[PDB]
Amino acid sequence: NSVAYSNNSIAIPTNFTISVTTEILPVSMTKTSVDCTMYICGDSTECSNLLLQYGSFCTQLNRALTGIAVEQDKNTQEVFAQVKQIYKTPPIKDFGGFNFSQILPDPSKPSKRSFIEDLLFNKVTLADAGFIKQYGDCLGDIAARDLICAQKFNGLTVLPPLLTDEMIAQYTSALLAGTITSGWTFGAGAALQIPFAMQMAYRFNGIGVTQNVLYENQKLIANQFNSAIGKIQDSLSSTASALGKLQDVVNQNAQALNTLVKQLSSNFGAISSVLNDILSRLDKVEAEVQIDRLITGRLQSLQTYVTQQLIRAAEIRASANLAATKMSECVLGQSKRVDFCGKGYHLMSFPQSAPHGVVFLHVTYVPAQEKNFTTAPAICHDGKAHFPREGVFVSNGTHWFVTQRNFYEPQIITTDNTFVSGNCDVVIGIVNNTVYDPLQPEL
Amino acid sequence: NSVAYSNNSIAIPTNFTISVTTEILPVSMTKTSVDCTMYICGDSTECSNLLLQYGSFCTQLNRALTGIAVEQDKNTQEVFAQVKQIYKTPPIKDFGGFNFSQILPDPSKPSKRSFIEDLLFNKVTLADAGFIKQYGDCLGDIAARDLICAQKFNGLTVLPPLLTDEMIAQYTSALLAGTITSGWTFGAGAALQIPFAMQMAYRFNGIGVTQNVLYENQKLIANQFNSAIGKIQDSLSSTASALGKLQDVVNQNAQALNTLVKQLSSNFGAISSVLNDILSRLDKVEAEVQIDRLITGRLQSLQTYVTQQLIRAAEIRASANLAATKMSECVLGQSKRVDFCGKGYHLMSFPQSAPHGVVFLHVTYVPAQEKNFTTAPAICHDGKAHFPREGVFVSNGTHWFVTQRNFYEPQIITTDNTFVSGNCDVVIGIVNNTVYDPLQPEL
Amino acid sequence: NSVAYSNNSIAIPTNFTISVTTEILPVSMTKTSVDCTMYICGDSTECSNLLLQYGSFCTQLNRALTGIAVEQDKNTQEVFAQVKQIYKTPPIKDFGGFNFSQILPDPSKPSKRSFIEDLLFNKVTLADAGFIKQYGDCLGDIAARDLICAQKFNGLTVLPPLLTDEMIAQYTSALLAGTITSGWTFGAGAALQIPFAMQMAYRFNGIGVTQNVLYENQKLIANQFNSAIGKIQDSLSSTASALGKLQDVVNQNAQALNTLVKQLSSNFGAISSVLNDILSRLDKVEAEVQIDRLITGRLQSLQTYVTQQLIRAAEIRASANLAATKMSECVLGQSKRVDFCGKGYHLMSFPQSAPHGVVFLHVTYVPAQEKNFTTAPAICHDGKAHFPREGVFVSNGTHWFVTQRNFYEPQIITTDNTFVSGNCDVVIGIVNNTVYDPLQPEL
Ligand SMILES: *[C@@H]1O[C@H](CO)[C@@H](O)[C@H](O)[C@H]1NC(C)=O
Ligand SMILES: *[C@@H]1O[C@H](CO)[C@@H](O)[C@H](O)[C@H]1NC(C)=O
Ligand SMILES: *[C@@H]1O[C@H](CO)[C@@H](O)[C@H](O)[C@H]1NC(C)=O
Ligand SMILES: *[C@@H]1O[C@H](CO)[C@@H](O)[C@H](O)[C@H]1NC(C)=O
Ligand SMILES: *[C@@H]1O[C@H](CO)[C@@H](O)[C@H](O)[C@H]1NC(C)=O
Ligand SMILES: *[C@@H]1O[C@H](CO)[C@@H](O)[C@H](O)[C@H]1NC(C)=O
Ligand SMILES: *[C@@H]1O[C@H](CO)[C@@H](O)[C@H](O)[C@H]1NC(C)=O
Ligand SMILES: *[C@@H]1O[C@H](CO)[C@@H](O)[C@H](O)[C@H]1NC(C)=O
Ligand SMILES: *[C@@H]1O[C@H](CO)[C@@H](O)[C@H](O)[C@H]1NC(C)=O
Ligand SMILES: *[C@@H]1O[C@H](CO)[C@@H](O)[C@H](O)[C@H]1NC(C)=O
Ligand SMILES: *[C@@H]1O[C@H](CO)[C@@H](O)[C@H](O)[C@H]1NC(C)=O
Ligand SMILES: *[C@@H]1O[C@H](CO)[C@@H](O)[C@H](O)[C@H]1NC(C)=O
Ligand SMILES: *[C@@H]1O[C@H](CO)[C@@H](O)[C@H](O)[C@H]1NC(C)=O
Ligand SMILES: *[C@@H]1O[C@H](CO)[C@@H](O)[C@H](O)[C@H]1NC(C)=O
Ligand SMILES: *[C@@H]1O[C@H](CO)[C@@H](O)[C@H](O)[C@H]1NC(C)=O
Ligand SMILES: *[C@@H]1O[C@H](CO)[C@@H](O)[C@H](O)[C@H]1NC(C)=O
Ligand SMILES: *[C@@H]1O[C@H](CO)[C@@H](O)[C@H](O)[C@H]1NC(C)=O
Ligand SMILES: *[C@@H]1O[C@H](CO)[C@@H](O)[C@H](O)[C@H]1NC(C)=O
């Protein structure tokens, strides 16, 4: 506000020089297209395959670059469909049909008491009726010690049936003596044959008791052998049956184990195949995500490029409007605007064609020599502050004149050159001068 | 079209007032940079690590914000490479080397017929030659019942060798009687010794047949014992061999089962490790995708911000062009345009520097009091419709004058103030007036 | 440069025609909002659920479309949080507690030497004392061949106790003869009883040796039976113990196998559940990535649409500024610009309201008939090259005049109509003419 009355210097030209100026204004823009495939993906196959799933955004970008507005609507052309091509998992069978059999888990608690008394079947054979060590040592080699040292039993008298040479000789001699005395004696002289019959009966009783002992021993051996053979047969049959049952159980367990091994191999193969497929899918997904990240980054870069191109197109349309108005105001007319039809005061302009632009040949005159003059916003001649019309107030140091800003022509301040505006109070900046008015035409 | 002759009121100013106006026009813009790391990721490490894979789009955004165009080319700087750091799967071994052995699967069908006839080896011993219950009950205690009740055989006569006291006494008495009668009789009186020899021979035959029976029984027992012992030895050896084979089979199966358990533990550990790695990778991928979604959203927001900044830069360049033309038309000249160098009719302007802008001090005069006047597009003075040049037609109610739109100065309609245009037929809006032309200069 | 003096033709109008022109200039824009949910997702639920994770970018887009700048700050509203809702893996138990027992793995190497000598326990019974085939064939049916063919032993004489009818008859006859001769002879006539006692003693010795052989055979059978029964009992007990131990081992192995099968089923079920969950998560991630790709593409399309809308808003603001300056220069004043307030030289303009725009009714006069004239940049009248001010130099073929570019009025070239500029050397294009200056006012 205070700079209004600061009597700033105004440059008023004095001389001019004709100058020719050439100006180029862009009107149209070269049609720029964008190939998103080559921009986002540089000679990459998987990149293009993944970009094919991003949609038809490149078509919208190209239509926006050509000058066609992008439509705002719903998804009547793009579908988020899925096919679910996932494979079915191989059947991992359950291990429930494997029943390993035992031998005697719980057979109603039989508890069979065998009680094999095979050791108790021993033959404790009874001895003989004697005459084994007593008679054998008492007789010796003397036949006279046969009758006087004859062994006996608990209620009988026994003698061994083994005779000797001297024994039978003495027996024959006694028999002959008895037979001789029987034919010559009437009393008891024939008693010599009594000991013969006595020892004969004793040997008979000995043979009988030995035969009885042997028969009892044979009966004992027979019954003991029968019982032992029966028990051995029973034990062997039971052992064979138990061994057969155990062998059947072992064979069943072995078959079940073979089947289990086969099913286990099948299940492990299925699990391995599933794991391999899962790992392949994981690797594919990781690679696809790592590619999509860079795809998104390059899409942001391409969107920035498209924004730049659209802003450039808008600026070129503005420059085309400027070229049209410059044509209308410089070629079809003489503009009074300063530094519009070139640089200076316009005289005449000529248009020239150009690729994507218009060339203007501006013929104007520039101020050769300029002089600074002290100016004021208004003067005051006894009130009624006057401001200049079609020109500015110019002072050379002592006098004030009115002239236009293009050329210096000092003219006296008259009423026909200025306009009154109120009084000299509101107008900031007041100088006192005299407004003459001759109005005297000559000739 | 019909509004042309609607005699619309035009505001013609009458008085003016000097006014000073200040205008600020932006020329340059403060250099704005974008830090994508801090904008997309607010103090987040994994966000920045994932953004590092999106590429160098931030460089292109900053270059676009600085005024450098984004290049449209292929991918000569970004590669979609991969290293495939996936680990190798632990070997899940197959269960094919486990062959559980059986005992007798198919040994060419031996079918060994044992036929153990151990029960048939019983000793059915034959009885004696009698004299066990018949002779024992017939004899009793009377020696006279020995010869008259003597038992016999099928073709012989047998007697037990067991004698008695009265029996041997009677035998001795008969022998003595026979020996006595032999020495006194010449005929058959010596027949008393016949029954003695008869019973002696009978006892001898009895001893012989008992010895034969015992010998046959001993032979039977011997052969039966030999056969039974042979069969028992065979059965025991076969049972021991079968038990040893079964024990070897069980031991082999147990070793195979231990090996199977070890291999099964190894395979399950490998599968568990693979599953843990797969789960970790899945969690990582899910987290990365969830982060990348918000990263893409914030990238869209940042792209919108960059678009706004670029449009603001374009508008500021347009405002700089406007400031340049305003400088040229207001400071270097006095513009005749209304409300361009401020607000009103321009007199003088002064430039002032400012940060990122130019300040203009416009000195102009605004219309103080305005008056509405009825105007017409053209008049008609006996044909040859006249339209005003350097001014408009203004009527105060009865008379029509010519004046400029900035100040009210009624002037008479003359030929030097108007221009003829055809006739009064095509021009829409026709009023009849008189175009005077004194052309009389005084003094 | 060379086209300046090319005497190009300038079109100077001669007649005019009043024309009314209507112009529409957009000022404001209809408030456009963007619904990202319906644009990116067309009637899709999972698409909207996934877009909800992209953030509040739609709010920023709408605020930018409304005219509010997008803020550039850190992430004080969006968090990249995670909850880690991953399930815990079912415990895959290890197979370490399964200890399959053997029978005799390494029991300090007992190596028990059984050495069952059951075959060596045979009864090789000794024969009798003869008289089985020799005496039986030598005796026959003649009692006389009994004493003369009597068998003997190695040191004794034995005879079988089996007599015959003729044998006992001859014995009785010899005994009777001896008893008769004993009573009538004094010498050795009683020797007839010697062979009787001899054969009696021989039969006694035979019975004795047969009894001894039978007793020895019974002792042999007894000891052999005892030893064989002991060995058989030992073997049976050992076999039963080994069979019981093997049965216990088989039962333990079967129980361990059942437990192993149960644990294996549990582990396989756990692995199957884990694999199913992993497959479900993989399918979900794949579908989500395939949706996010198209979401990103449509987001790029929407960003392009927003950029277009913002550029249109900027252009509409520029058109509003143009409408304001056209209002100020055509309605509030008469502009001297050609083809600015319509098409032609402006006379008066009238404003009319319109939805989102201002309608201008421009009243102007267009050049009816135009004539081409040869123009020059400057003339030369004895040096001091003159260029026209407020008009251009126009020649009709022989004479040069000064006139304005809007109407054809030939005026004589005077000093008050031209300006001197240096000399006729620098000014490109020089023509020689005469600059008159009458300055003679009449009347
Ligand atoms: C006004 O005039 C004074 C007197 O010489 C001078 O000092 C001052 O600089 C002038 N103001 C301008 C040129 O703005
Ligand atoms: C095996 O079979 C037996 C009888 O056939 C039955 O009692 C048992 O429950 C079964 N065990 C299994 C695991 O099927
Ligand atoms: C007029 O004033 C300007 C203001 O800086 C100055 O640059 C110029 O040299 C001055 N001209 C003369 C002739 O003094
Ligand atoms: C200013 O112009 C007047 C008018 O011609 C003249 O008399 C005077 O000498 C000039 N110079 C000064 C310093 O006043
Ligand atoms: C306003 O204009 C009228 C027109 O004649 C004039 O008489 C009057 O003095 C003016 N007033 C001011 C304050 O300029
Ligand atoms: C102009 O004249 C008035 C009237 O006397 C006076 O008040 C004022 O100070 C004068 N101004 C100048 C600059 O001489
Ligand atoms: C034209 O003049 C008539 C007569 O008073 C008036 O009613 C009408 O409003 C005028 N038309 C305008 C001012 O546009
Ligand atoms: C086991 O071995 C036997 C003979 O050694 C053979 O016949 C059989 O096919 C084998 N079984 C397996 C499953 O290898
Ligand atoms: C001139 O006409 C305009 C049109 O609305 C009106 O606003 C204004 O008040 C009028 N002025 C006079 C002095 O009648
Ligand atoms: C209009 O102007 C004329 C010309 O001076 C004048 O005679 C007349 O009184 C004014 N007013 C009317 C209503 O005509
Ligand atoms: C066209 O201009 C010529 C120039 O003298 C004039 O004679 C003629 O009447 C004009 N015609 C029209 C229709 O304005
Ligand atoms: C002007 O005069 C002509 C010639 O008689 C006549 O036809 C026309 O109606 C008049 N117009 C007016 C507005 O008086
Ligand atoms: C200049 O005048 C010559 C002479 O007729 C003519 O051939 C040439 O075309 C003119 N140059 C123009 C019209 O630019
Ligand atoms: C099984 O147990 C035995 C003794 O109880 C031991 O020596 C052996 O190492 C064990 N084996 C396993 C695999 O635990
Ligand atoms: C004036 O020159 C232009 C330039 O091509 C031409 O189109 C037009 O017809 C010419 N007019 C006359 C009247 O020769
Ligand atoms: C050109 O204008 C002059 C000046 O009136 C005139 O004498 C002449 O006949 C016109 N035509 C030519 C061809 O000079
Ligand atoms: C510059 O202007 C002065 C002002 O009188 C004049 O005398 C001189 O001749 C001019 N010089 C040129 C080269 O125009
Ligand atoms: C103009 O006159 C000068 C002075 O004699 C002469 O040198 C020049 O050639 C003339 N130019 C023309 C176009 O006649």
Side-chain angles (χ1 to χ4, degrees), chain A residues 9 11 370-372:
Chain A
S9 300
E370 57 181 1
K371 223 292 180 59
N372 295 12

Side-chain angles (χ1 to χ4, degrees), chain A residues 53 281 288 317 336, chain C residues 283 293 304 315 337 390:
Chain A
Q53 301 182 6
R281 292 177 57 180
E288 288 180 359
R317 291 193 296 266
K336 305 181 184 303
Chain C
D283 301 359
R293 295 172 190 171
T304 303
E315 292 182 350
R337 304 169 63 178
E390 198 69 21

Side-chain angles (χ1 to χ4, degrees), chain C residues 9-11 370-373:
Chain C
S9 300
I10 266 65
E370 57 181 1
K371 223 291 180 59
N372 296 13
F373 298 98

Side-chain angles (χ1 to χ4, degrees), chain C residues 325-340:
Chain C
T325 185
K326 278 194 175 182
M327 177 82 62
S328 299
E329 295 185 12
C330 312
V331 180
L332 302 180
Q334 182 177 355
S335 181
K336 305 181 185 304
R337 304 169 63 178
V338 184
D339 299 359
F340 179 76

Side-chain angles (χ1 to χ4, degrees), chain B residues 39-40 43 204-205 211 218 229 265 283 286 293 298 300 304-305 308 315 337 390 405 421 441, chain C residues 53 68 70 72 74-75 78 94-95 118 161 217 281 288 292 300 303 317 329 332-333 336 443:
Chain B
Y39 185 85
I40 313 297
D43 295 330
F204 285 166
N205 293 17
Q211 192 79 193
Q218 286 184 354
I229 260 53
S265 298
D283 301 358
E286 291 180 359
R293 295 171 190 173
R298 299 203 63 87
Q300 298 294 338
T304 303
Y305 171 81
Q308 271 192 334
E315 291 182 352
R337 302 169 62 180
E390 198 69 20
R405 293 201 84 268
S421 60
Chain C
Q53 301 181 4
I68 307 179
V70 180
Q72 179 184 1
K74 299 177 75 280
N75 269 266
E78 291 75 13
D94 190 8
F95 304 93
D118 189 69
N217 176 81
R281 292 178 57 180
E288 287 180 0
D292 289 332
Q300 299 294 339
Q303 182 63 31
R317 291 196 296 265
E329 295 185 12
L332 302 180
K336 305 181 185 304
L443 285 312

Side-chain angles (χ1 to χ4, degrees), chain C residues 5 376-380 385-386 423-433:
Chain C
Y5 68 100
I379 62 178
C380 188
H386 314 271
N423 301 330
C424 312
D425 37 58
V426 176
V427 180
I428 167 177
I430 289 300
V431 290
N432 295 15
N433 289 282

